[PDB]
Amino acid sequence: CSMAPTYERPAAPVADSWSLDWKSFIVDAELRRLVDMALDNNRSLRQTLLDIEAARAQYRIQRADRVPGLNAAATGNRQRQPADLSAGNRSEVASSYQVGLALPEYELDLFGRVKSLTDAALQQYLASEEAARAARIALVAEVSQAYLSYDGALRRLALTRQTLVSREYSFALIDQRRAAGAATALDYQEALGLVEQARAEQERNLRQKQQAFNALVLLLGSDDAAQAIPRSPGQRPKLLQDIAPGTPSELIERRPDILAAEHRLRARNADIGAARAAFFPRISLTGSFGTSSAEMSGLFDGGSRSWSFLPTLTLPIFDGGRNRANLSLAEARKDSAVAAYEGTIQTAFREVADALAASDTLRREEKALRALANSSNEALKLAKARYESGVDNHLRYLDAQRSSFLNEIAFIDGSTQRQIALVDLFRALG
Amino acid sequence: CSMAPTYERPAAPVADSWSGAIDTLDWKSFIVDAELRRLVDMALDNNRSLRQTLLDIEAARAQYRIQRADRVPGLNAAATGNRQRQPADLSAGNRSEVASSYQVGLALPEYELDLFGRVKSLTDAALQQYLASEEAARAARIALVAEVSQAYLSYDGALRRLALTRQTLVSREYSFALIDQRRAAGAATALDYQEALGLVEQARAEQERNLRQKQQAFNALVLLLGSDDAAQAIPRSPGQRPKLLQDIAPGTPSELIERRPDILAAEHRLRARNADIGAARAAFFPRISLTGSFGTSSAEMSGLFDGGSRSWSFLPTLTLPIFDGGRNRANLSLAEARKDSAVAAYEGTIQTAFREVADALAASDTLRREEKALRALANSSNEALKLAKARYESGVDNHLRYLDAQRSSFLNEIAFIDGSTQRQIALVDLFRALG
Amino acid sequence: CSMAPTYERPAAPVADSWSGIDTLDWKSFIVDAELRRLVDMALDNNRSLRQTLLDIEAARAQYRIQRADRVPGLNAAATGNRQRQPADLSAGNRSEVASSYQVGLALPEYELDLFGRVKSLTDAALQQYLASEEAARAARIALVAEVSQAYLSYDGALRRLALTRQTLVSREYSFALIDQRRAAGAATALDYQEALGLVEQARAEQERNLRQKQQAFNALVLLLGSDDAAQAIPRSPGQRPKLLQDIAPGTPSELIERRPDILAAEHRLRARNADIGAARAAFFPRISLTGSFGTSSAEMSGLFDGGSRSWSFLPTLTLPIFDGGRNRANLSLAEARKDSAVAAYEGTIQTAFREVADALAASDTLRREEKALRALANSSNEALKLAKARYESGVDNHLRYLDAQRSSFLNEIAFIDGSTQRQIALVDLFRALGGGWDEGRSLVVH
CATH class of the missing domain: 2.20.200.10 (Outer membrane efflux proteins (OEP))
Structure with a gap:
């Protein structure tokens, strides 16, 4: 006999609608190389892999009681x-x-108390393996996000460096106009303030770059992980621009988080079966x-x-x-596993909805960012010639140099925010 | 003959009052907005994080009953x-x-x-842990009332910014169409068209930003409510701005010690360890x-x-x-060390509550003054933009004044929404901090 | 006779250097006498530290409990x-x-214990308490650093407030000239609105700076953790820099031996090596x-x-x-648990490497950024004086003056932020490095 109740999956408390391989997803040959290194050597994932070895040994400890x-x-x-x-x-x-x-x-084992306990230890072993899958999904997504930010930093640094040489050469021209006497002193300072902005932003971009590089070196977890990353990155898109979300019902059966949570509820259900056999x-x-x-x-x-x-x-x-308290305790633990399961579903529902809302917005934003960056860069060139001729004051040209630089960086930003929110979708689905 | 020490409440290690500029009121009394009360009730009844904390009260009661069963x-x-x-x-x-x-x-x-009161001590210890969980649930309850209000205001802000960004977008494209016709004729220069073009492209990108914000704020608000019927519950219209009482009297910290759940739970966890000493004592x-x-x-x-x-x-x-x-001495050393750790905890949560109320108090009087300043600032920018258009229609001044005056009128109107939002979130934080 | 395997330190899982402290203790590192007093005060009365110190006395007891079983x-x-x-x-x-x-x-x-299972369980409990020590060393160094940062933020906020108020009063005088000129008809109504805008920007900024100051203050009060801490916090800025600007990091091989996190993990690893000897003794x-x-x-x-x-x-x-x-399964569990502790020991060193790396990168880039931000600041201030003269002559429209006022004020705040952020990075570096040699023995008082 076995007093453990019959497990029924709780009805998904989420709404029925929203408003597949990792190598297959990650097209870039080097990033996929990096993820393979990280997946082999990342120490936090390694702990979670050895968590399942412990959880297996606990089931083996419980199985021993049946014989x-x-x-x-x-x-x-x-x-x-x-x-x-x-x-x-x-x-x-x-x-x-x-x-x-x-x-x-x-x-x-007439009433299946030990059977039930051995069953619970199996369900937590299986819940550990689903947690190891969740961590694997999380690692690949974190390695990619860190490579996209590292890339995004290098794009900013390269832009800033071309911006710096431009403003340095443009300042040299304004300096010697004053040495002649033709240049205003205000014009000279406004051009200087431009050059320093670029130097200060370059430092900021060097920081972002190397902090992203260090974060990557960690996540790889090799002693040679600094060697493995390319200093010159491939500028082609690294991931599949479009992914179909699917039904939320498919997500519930697909995502490791959910599977880890249901298996916990099964273990807790078996626990009830042990409390009953004590009576x-x-x-x-x-x-x-x-x-x-x-x-x-x-x-x-x-x-x-x-x-x-x-x-x-x-x-x-x-x-x-005592035994009714043991029953009341096992039932409360079970009810929590149900609430945990329900809450884990509802969370995953919100995480993909966020990733969709983001991806829809970010595709539509990045078009506005490019066209503004082109509108700013042409307005820069018109205003340059208007000052250079001597029709308008230096302010308009100055203001255009700021706007050009801001808009071109803000584009590099929103382009990287589009690709990271894409991998956030791949994580959130599983 | 219970050998547990006589419990005296540790003295509060905080100031006898609060620095700078009634708290018996109900949360329904605090929240004037009837829509928000409906949302918070639905969250109270359906959230899963709160459900899980209420269910480990149920666990904690059972654990008390298992120790109480040992007595008889x-x-x-x-x-x-x-x-x-x-x-x-x-x-x-x-x-x-x-x-x-x-x-x-x-x-x-x-x-x-149980001549020496060993098992009664363990039973008192388990009772206290259960009473702690009861207060831990009262905390989780308050936490969620705040989280819903903060999420709903953040969402209310996100749509209110979206509403200005789209109205600004329309007038943006309309003013571009006038410069487009002027440039098509050949009167207006290539730059005045280009500056109006980029600025429309910028206001396109800002609308997308505010759209994502409201959608992400919608999603977060749906989860909090934790119901299948949740999307239907939320308004798409912005409610009237006074959604909660603006004036609350925080009283002393000594009043806070007896009100705030986190503290009272930590007090019960201290009492649990006094008991545990009585058990270690009786084991001798x-x-x-x-x-x-x-x-x-x-x-x-x-x-x-x-x-x-x-x-x-x-x-x-x-x-x-x-x-x-x-061993028995080592076990009494342990119990005394854990009593002390519980005193440090009890005191450490009071100090932490202190910071939280103090931050909320500071935030609420700084944001009141900052709000008045931001509303006045935006209005000077808005009228400064009216005057920059008159100078452009007359032709007396360049596009660049008219450009700066609409960037800065737009940023200042956004900043005012953010500033108005942040203030009322701080009133929620002050309600959260006082318990 | 303990049958556990002989403990060997895992080889370091990171390179032998950083691409381009022993003597330095926190009292030497922190130069400001006022900050030293604040750190001293938190170290005595901080309740989170107090808890991690009492976690040692609890772990000692549990070592004494397993010892008891031995006799x-x-x-x-x-x-x-x-x-x-x-x-x-x-x-x-x-x-x-x-x-x-x-x-x-x-x-x-x-x-x-002829085959030595109880001694191994005693070794495990011994190491657990030795880890508990190292853990509290870290928590103390982390306290030092956290109070330092919270004060540096506090300091910075008073500077932003000072500037904002100086800026503000200039804007009140400038506007009074234009309120008179627009009353006279000598300045445009648009110039008058722009000038009013400037005043409000600084007024709103004043309020932001006040909150920033008060919240940083309230944090300090918490970390100090005393009834009389508020009285002990300076109400006015510390005149000079409050830390040593140039710290030499040393190798990663040295960091392994110094940093608490690493040593805490090492003791835990050695505790699990014992638990294997207890499982081997079960056979x-x-x-x-x-x-x-x-x-x-x-x-x-x-x-x-x-x-x-x-x-x-x-x-x-x-x-x-x-x-x-079962006795096989226990041994497999004991091996698994030990392996997780080894990976944890490796992961701690790797994570320490990232934090140190990020901190030197922050320090060096912010050094140069600060110089550039200083150069930008006084450039915009000289251009402010020129644009002011150019506007007052009637030569230019207001926009050039207005834009210079905005740019100067925004750049001068940006310098304060950048400067304080460099000092916060120097503190982050000290923490990540983990203090000099054996920074703390507040832990062993029993």
Whole structure:
């Protein structure tokens, strides 16, 4: 028999609608190379891989209880008792030695208490493997995001460097106009403030670059992970621009997070089955089988055979209210596993909805960012010539140089924000 | 005879009052917005994080009942058989004897008589942990009331910014069409068209930003509500700005000590450790263990229920340790160290509550003044843009004044929404911090 | 005789250098006398530190508990047993009600660890408390750093406030000139609105700076964790730089030996190497012995009497031929757990490398960024004076003056932010490095 209830999956509390391989997804040959390195060597994932080895050993520990064992023991008992207590009526020293095999307390499994406990340890083992899958998904997504940011930094640094040489050469022209006398002093300072902006932004971009590089070196986790990353990155898109979201129902059966959570609920359901079997009578066997003697010299002799066999049944009648508390505790734990499962679904529903809302917005933004960057860069060139001729003051040209630079960086930003939100979608689906 | 120390509440390590510029009110009294109350009620009834915290109250009660069950004697029905081959030298018969012994009846598992208050201490400890969980749930409740209000205002802000960004986009494209017709004729220069073009392209990108924000804020607000019926519950119209009471009197910190759940839970977790000392104390003293059986027994099975076959056993056992390996002392050291850690915790949560209320107080009077400044700033920019258009229509001034005046009128109007939003979120933070 | 394998330090999983502290302690590192006083104050009365210190005294106790199991105990005891039995079961062949009593010293359940399982469990608990020490060293260094940062943020906010107020008063004077000119008809209504805008920007900025100051203050009060901490925080900026600007990082091989995080993990690893020795010891047989000494009698009166002296002595040996695969599974679990601790030890060093790396990169780039930001600041301030003269002549429209005022104020804030952020990066570097040699022995006070 087994008192564990029948497991029914709780109805997905999310709405029915929203408003596949990692190598297949990650097209870039080097990024995929990097993810393979990280997947092989990342130490946080390695801990989660050894978590499942522990969880397997716990099931193996519980499985051991279902089978009866066999132990070779030797037990001497020597004691001086009073005259008063013994049948002899004169105070005596009694000795008794035993050797041979013995059966440690073995539970007959009529109500499936141990069966149920062994089942729970399986479900947490399986929930550990689903957690290791979730971490694997999370690692690949984190390695990619860190490569996209590293790339995005290098695009900013390259832009800033071409912006710096432009403003440095453009400043040299304004300096010698004042040395002549033709240049305003305000114009000279406004051109200087431009050059320093570029130097300060280059420092910011060098920081972002190397902090992204270090984060990558960590996530790879090799001693040679600094060598493995290319200093000059391939500028082609690294991932599939479009992914179909699918039904939320498919997500529930697909995503490791969900599978880890349902398996926890199954373990908790098995736990109920153990609480129920405690109310029912426990039966157990103890056994000893070997050779008993009165002296050390009489144990390796003929006809010294001896055995003990002890079956015992026991049924709790009165507790302090313990078994019903154990039942109430296992049920509360189960109800939490259900709420956990429901909440884990609802979360995953929100994480993909966010990734879709982002991806829809970011495709539509990046077109506005490019066209503004082109509108700014042409307005820069018109305003350049308007100052350079001498029609308008330096301010318009100055303001256009700021706007050009801001808009061109803000594009590099929103392009990288589009590709990262794409991998966030691949993670959130699973 | 409970050996737990007499519990005195640790003195509060915070200021006797709050620095710079009624708190008996209900959260429904605090939240004037009837829509927001409906959303928060739905969150209260359906959220899963709160559900999980309420359910480990249920766990904590059961754990108390398992310790409370240890206090009272129990009774098992039992049936035990024993068979054994005893050899001649140990046996009374002087020949190899096989003896069986089947017995059946009621039995008493090892019962500890609580003279020294050991088990009562453990039971008081488990009770206190249950009362802590009760307060931990009252906290989780308040946390979620705040999180819903913060999420709903953040969402209300995101659509209110979207609403200005689209109206600005329309007037943006309309003013570009006028410069497009002027440039098509050949009067207006290539730059005045290009500057108006880029600026329309910029306002396109900002609308997308605000769209994503409201969608992400919608999603986060849906999860909080945690219901299948959630998307229907949320308004797409922005409610009237006074969604909560603007004026609250925080009172002293000493009033906060008795009100705020986090603290009261931490106090109960302290009381739990005072008890645990009483258990470690009592373990030094003797332990009186009682077992007993009662019913029938025999050598053969058929004569179990037989006349004059009554067989019982009554075993009291007393044990007191002279020496171990300093374990009982090591166990009292542990319990005293954990008591102290609970005092530090209790005090550490009060200090933390202090910071939180103090931040909320500072934020709320700075954002009041900042809001007035930002509203006045945006209005000067808005009228400065009116005057920059007059200068452009007259032709007396360049496009660049008219460009700066609409960038800065747009940024200042965005910043005012952010500033108005941030203030009322701080009133929620002040409600959250006071408990 | 402990059968656990010989402990060997895992080779460092990162390169031998950083692409381009022993002597330095926190009191040497922090130059400002006022900040030193703040750090001292938090170290005494910080409650999160206090908790991690009491976690050591708890871990010591649990080491003392496992030690206890290693030596034999002895205890006094009084055992009564009254029992009825029928004739068919009694050896006397009659309705017998026999009683017995015992009083005296009992030795319970002592285990001779010939194969050494209990010593290994004692080693595990020893290392756990040695990790608990290192853990609190980290938490203390982290406290130093956190108070330092919170003060540096506090300092910075007072500077932004000072500027904002200076800026603000200039804007109030400038506007009063234009309010008069627009009253006279000498300035345009658009110039008057722009000037009013400038005033409000700085007014709103004042309020932002005040919150920033007060929240950083409230954080400091918390970290100090004292009733009288608020009085101990300086109300005015520290005149000069408050830390040493140039810290030499040393190798990563040195960081392994110094940094608390790494050593905490190392002790935990060594604790799991012991738990393997305990699982290996489970395969060999368990020798348990029990004994008694005292007086026993049939009736309660006869207890303490001549010829009542009774003793008990029973040693058991227990070897399992079959388990259920449990002793194998325990060993597999002990190997798994040890392997996770080794990976944790590696991951800690790797994570320390990233934090150090990020911190030097931050320090060096912010050095140069600050110089550039200083150069940009006073460029925009000189151009402010020129644009002011150019506007006041009537030569230019207001926009050039207005834009210079905006740019100067925004660049001067940006310098304060950048400068304070460099100092916060110097603190982040100190933490990531993890202090000099054996920075703290506040931990071992018992």
